[PDB]
Amino acid sequence: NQPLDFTQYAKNMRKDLSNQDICLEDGALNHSYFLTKKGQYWTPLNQKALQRGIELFGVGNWKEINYDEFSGKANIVELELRTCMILGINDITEYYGKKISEEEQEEIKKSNIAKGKKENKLKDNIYQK
Amino acid sequence: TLEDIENEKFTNLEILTHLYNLKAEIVRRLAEQ
Amino acid sequence: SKKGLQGLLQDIEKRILHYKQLFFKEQNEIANGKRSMVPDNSIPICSDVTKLNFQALIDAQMRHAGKMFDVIMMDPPWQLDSLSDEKIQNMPIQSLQQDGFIFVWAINAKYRVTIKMIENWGYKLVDEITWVKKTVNGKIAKGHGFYLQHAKESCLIGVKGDVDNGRFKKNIASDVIFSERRGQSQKPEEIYQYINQLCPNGNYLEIFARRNNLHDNWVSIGNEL
Amino acid sequence: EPGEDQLSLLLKWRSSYIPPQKPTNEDEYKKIICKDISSEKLEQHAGDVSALFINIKWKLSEGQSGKSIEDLKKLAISDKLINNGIIFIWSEKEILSQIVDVLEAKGFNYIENFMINQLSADKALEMQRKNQWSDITPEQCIEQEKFPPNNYVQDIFVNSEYSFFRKSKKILLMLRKFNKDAQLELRHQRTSDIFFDIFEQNKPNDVSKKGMEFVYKMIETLLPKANYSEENKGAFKMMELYADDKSQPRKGWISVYEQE
DNA sequence: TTCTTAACATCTTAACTTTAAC
DNA sequence: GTTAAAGTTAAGATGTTAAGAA
Ligand SMILES: C[S@@+](CC[C@H](N)C(=O)[O-])C[C@H]1O[C@@H](n2cnc3c(N)ncnc32)[C@H](O)[C@@H]1O
């Protein structure tokens, strides 16, 4: 018979016994977590968490949004680092204290990408001003 | 200071964390005097 | 020092710009699908060994392969990360394996107790492989010790059941691994090559593992992993 | 230059270890030649020694000559023969656990290990053929200390005939005998626990005169008080059982022979 | 008080700097 | 301006043994 090819077999084991943060869909190693150090990966649960938490709460102050959050692996510096991409712009000083829903956030993200492409200075989705 | 924060064995996100920490401390100092 | 440290503030703001750009580039490469050094056929588990139930591993392996494990590696966190010399024995290795091998890495202070542990589980002492530490120039890396200058790390091999079958090739590799130091406590990668010379196409289980090895077809129980 | 070579850089204590000549004055060396330790009485030819050596040729396979564990089971060791000493015994891995428990029943606790890594002279000659003087015997390599160049020493290990991981090792199990009252005087770390020794193929069970000098000197430095100096006359505090002809007649040692 | 348990006991190599020629 | 000798230093999965917490 077949000598137990290991791809789908390992996929089934990762479905069964491995951690939920290592396998996505049916079978995937989730390489984005084995190249980053332990405790800091920003799971899709965290992504949706801050995506739903940037609204209905005062932006700028991340202590008050982290008090009602997990209060775990949610350090502030990662929050200001990864909220920039949701905005699309590195600078946040002009975008303090105002709340914008997710679809308009994606709209202004696309607008920032387009203006960076037209201004031929984009550096991997990141626009500087 | 600037060197131990810039260590290569230090992971980059924690480099950002401690480096932001000394920015906060020094701007608190300029707030002081 | 107000103006000088204001210039230092400008310097670390340039550091903000450089480091934010560097991490944004690396994270964009991550989201683009950058592959880590880990192989796609690695089966990891992040749970405490004294806490997890191994019966789930047993019937998962029996369902997905139909056989039991071939090699159970372990490099225990010896008591001298603490554990004990009773909690290591009390965990169910004798059910995790039926016919195979076990590699238990021991220090010179934990030799007799390791031999007693292996003999208690049902294995019989068969072989020992030793890691000989090396320097970058090639000289032996000797350090510490009481009666002699230590340059050694031992590991003992226990065999449970029958070995005369298609797997488990005889007269392979060597029991002495002459290799450089590459960590505070990090065994060489030649032992894995020796294992794959011993049992090709196997279902190996490794306990007390770290993210350094995580090889192909390996079940890699650990906690900080 | 010999420095760049990995072989010649790993084997440089050879020129620094010359075993001394045979003792003559009849005070230095002792002989209690007899038929068998498990047959003769012991602890009456000597008393209260500090270094016990058993040069054992284990049989392993039944066809191969040697002795098995039952001789050590019936070995005559009392508190009179050795009370505070450390016992040095050559061990394999097939009977390592057996040696450990049979010496545990007498009170000797394992404290440390000291191994020798084999490097084959036949392997060096074959490699120098495969890469390229080099038309001489392996024993001549052992004698002249003429080591052909080799920057990778991990290929030069001996090829055994084991049914498992191939054998390239030689283990000396040293076991303490705790007394807690008379104690043992010792210096700590003036010896490495590994030394790469040159051997000969088809005969790995023989350590040469330089390796014997190394192990004897590490015993003698490990136990300085048992060195022959003004007080060991009749108080030798060192013997070797199953003594060999080479390097055993020693100033301060009792050579326990084995008559047929 | 008693067994542990903190709490003390030294050797080789590879690199890194500093200084004396030359 | 270059090469070599001397001081330095940092690291390498040791252990017996006086002291003392239950
Ligand atoms: C000394 S390391 C051995 C790792 C191995 N030498 C390697 O680098 O592949 C022991 C590891 O076991 C894990 N571990 C320690 N204590 C554990 C425990 N109580 N239960 C489960 N895993 C544990 C930790 O990840 C620790 O790093």
mmCIF file of C-alpha atoms (C1' of nucleotides) and ligand atoms in Angstrom, chain C residues 47-50 75-77 81-83 185-187 192 206 208-210 212-213 222-225, chain F residues 13, ligand 1:
data_model
loop_
_atom_site.group_PDB
_atom_site.id
_atom_site.type_symbol
_atom_site.label_atom_id
_atom_site.label_comp_id
_atom_site.label_asym_id
_atom_site.label_seq_id
_atom_site.Cartn_x
_atom_site.Cartn_y
_atom_site.Cartn_z
ATOM 1 C CA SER C 47 1.095 22.065 26.530
ATOM 2 C CA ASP C 48 2.711 20.935 29.770
ATOM 3 C CA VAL C 49 3.808 17.304 29.696
ATOM 4 C CA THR C 50 2.574 16.564 33.221
ATOM 5 C CA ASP C 75 16.001 15.725 26.795
ATOM 6 C CA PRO C 76 14.574 16.213 30.278
ATOM 7 C CA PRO C 77 14.855 19.499 32.207
ATOM 8 C CA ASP C 81 12.402 23.781 33.802
ATOM 9 C CA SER C 82 12.846 22.054 37.158
ATOM 10 C CA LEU C 83 10.577 18.945 37.152
ATOM 11 C CA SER C 185 21.667 23.901 26.255
ATOM 12 C CA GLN C 186 21.243 22.823 22.634
ATOM 13 C CA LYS C 187 22.021 19.349 21.325
ATOM 14 C CA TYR C 192 18.434 13.742 14.127
ATOM 15 C CA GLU C 206 9.942 14.219 21.075
ATOM 16 C CA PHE C 208 10.659 18.611 26.278
ATOM 17 C CA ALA C 209 11.330 20.201 22.892
ATOM 18 C CA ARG C 210 12.114 23.769 21.851
ATOM 19 C CA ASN C 212 15.110 25.062 17.442
ATOM 20 C CA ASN C 213 14.648 21.626 15.837
ATOM 21 C CA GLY C 222 6.760 21.197 24.627
ATOM 22 C CA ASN C 223 5.479 24.250 26.443
ATOM 23 C CA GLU C 224 7.572 27.248 25.380
ATOM 24 C CA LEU C 225 7.526 25.728 21.874
ATOM 25 C "C1'" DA F 13 24.272 21.398 31.353
HETATM 26 C C1 LIG G 1 16.626 21.921 28.767
HETATM 27 S S1 LIG G 1 15.399 22.153 27.481
HETATM 28 C C2 LIG G 1 15.751 20.789 26.330
HETATM 29 C C3 LIG G 1 15.598 21.237 24.885
HETATM 30 C C4 LIG G 1 16.479 20.501 23.858
HETATM 31 N N1 LIG G 1 17.829 20.341 24.356
HETATM 32 C C5 LIG G 1 16.458 21.264 22.519
HETATM 33 O O1 LIG G 1 17.055 22.367 22.525
HETATM 34 O O2 LIG G 1 15.870 20.744 21.561
HETATM 35 C C6 LIG G 1 13.914 21.485 28.262
HETATM 36 C C7 LIG G 1 12.668 22.119 27.696
HETATM 37 O O3 LIG G 1 11.534 21.421 28.171
HETATM 38 C C8 LIG G 1 10.470 22.291 28.408
HETATM 39 N N2 LIG G 1 9.931 22.077 29.739
HETATM 40 C C9 LIG G 1 10.554 22.467 30.892
HETATM 41 N N3 LIG G 1 9.893 22.181 31.970
HETATM 42 C C10 LIG G 1 8.762 21.563 31.512
HETATM 43 C C11 LIG G 1 7.650 21.017 32.178
HETATM 44 N N4 LIG G 1 7.526 21.025 33.504
HETATM 45 N N5 LIG G 1 6.685 20.470 31.437
HETATM 46 C C12 LIG G 1 6.814 20.466 30.117
HETATM 47 N N6 LIG G 1 7.803 20.942 29.384
HETATM 48 C C13 LIG G 1 8.762 21.485 30.128
HETATM 49 C C14 LIG G 1 10.982 23.719 28.128
HETATM 50 O O4 LIG G 1 10.668 24.106 26.821
HETATM 51 C C15 LIG G 1 12.498 23.554 28.186
HETATM 52 O O5 LIG G 1 13.224 24.416 27.370
#
